[PDB]
Assembly symmetry: C3
Homo-oligomer: 194 residues x 3
């Protein structure tokens, strides 16, 4: 959409929380990205990513086939109290749940089946989605239709972790404080100069 981008402009999103918190160049690079979005009012513009995005509604359907859950789509949900912070789960499930879908490279999917666990960056993403929505768990789905039937679908439930959420909110608050100050600082300097 264009409303898709507009709702996300200048905000810390759940999909990037791992860049915020890691112990880093990725934190500073994301900070620079959000500074430029807020100042310029626009964001900067592969095969596997595109193929992935296009498969996600297949994955969504497969999950409902496998579970019988009522799934509603949702856009960006703002954090209830931290301004400039939001999350975009791939669905609201029932009254208290969520779904986050990955449709990655085949080997990444296989490694998820092997370990049974989502990458730590996706744990952060999903805890943040829970933070923003008030939900109690998120079913993490990995899906690859290239594989034999009994390997295409993987799902595991990640329960709300209030300790991790409090730590995320602390870090994201600190990061947003630095972001807003940097923008204020740059602006005051340019204004004085002019």
């Amino acid at each position: 959409t264009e409303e898709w981008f507009a709702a996300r402009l200048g905000k810390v999103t759940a999909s990037r929380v791992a860049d915020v918190m890691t112990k880093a160049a990725s934190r500073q690079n994301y900070m620079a990205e959000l500074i430029c979005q807020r100042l310029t009012g626009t964001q900067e513009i592969n095969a596997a990513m595109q193929r992935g995005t296009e498969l996600e509604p297949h994955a969504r359907a497969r999950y409902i086939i496998e579970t019988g859950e009522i799934v509603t789509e949702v856009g960006l949900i703002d954090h209830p109290t931290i301004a400039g912070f939001g999350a975009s789960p791939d669905g609201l499930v029932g009254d208290t749940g969520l779904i986050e879908i990955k449709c990655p490279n085949t080997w990444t999917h296989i490694e998820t089946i092997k370990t049974g666990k989502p990458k730590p960056e996706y744990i952060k993403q999903m805890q943040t989605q829970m933070a923003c929505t008030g939900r109690q768990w998120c079913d993490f789905v990995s899906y690859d239709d290239r594989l034999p039937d009994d390997m295409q679908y993987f799902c595991t439930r990640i329960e709300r972790d209030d300790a991790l959420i409090a730590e995320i909110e602390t870090e994201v608050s600190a990061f947003l404080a630095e972001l807003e100050a940097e923008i204020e600082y740059l602006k005051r300097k340019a204004a004085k100069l002019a």
Copy 2:
């Protein structure tokens, strides 16, 4: 072709033997590639590579001009005894020889002229091609038509090395054993689960 891909699907090929044997991330990454090919039944899809492929018949012609050898084209030749292993030389030469052609970047070609020796990964490729076909030598040709005439063409003969071949076959056997077990293992787990 489509038969080109089909003949190569799931197999260790001579062009990748160096990834098998190196002392590595490249061995594990190739293993993952072949696992996914065998499980999914399909393979995943630059200017210099394309330009190169298109020049190889010029190089083939230049070699025959320079040598007068009878060259026959050939597709994938399976190893006589190791299943799932094969080689695709760029030509059969005479009764007992082979040709492997490179059409690389100009500087890579120049460095080949300087040292007089093919990269070790290409020694492995050519010994494997000899392993698969039973041939006795392979003429390694590097060709770049962008250069002055007296620098365009390079050729050096690599004689069959039975010791290196036995070592290649040992490594490739071990690698294929792990590959097939991994596929069996994944399948048994998924089947039990379902």
Copy 3:
């Protein structure tokens, strides 16, 4: 143009002087690039670079708006005494000055405003442009129209440094000596061989 490329073929240019002098792989990689250009008679062929090039006349206009200077465009200017060496400033300013324009990513522009100083590689570029033209200073302009008005335009003056220029000319002379010898060496070897 095509005359653009022709004037630059095989020459050390001001924009690459930093690769010549750094303490390196970049020196050897540039040397290889220039060897191949001289031998083959041709050179080898992103969004931000293209967007940048297209913005440079906006930046040029903004600079004249801001300063009132008379700016003339110029192509490649050969070093007065070092053969195979030249510079392409983005404009002659007045009788004694120059302009070098960057239209980079927004964050790079912001970092230039923060530090007030061009990257060391661009100091080398501009001292070389002064070396080639005999000029006395170069105004370094960074421009990004995506930003608020009071952050779009940055300019700082870099005065001719005769010590740095003598050191550049020494290094570039040594590099050109090695380049020409390498070409002579390769040619003599190929000629003897043929």
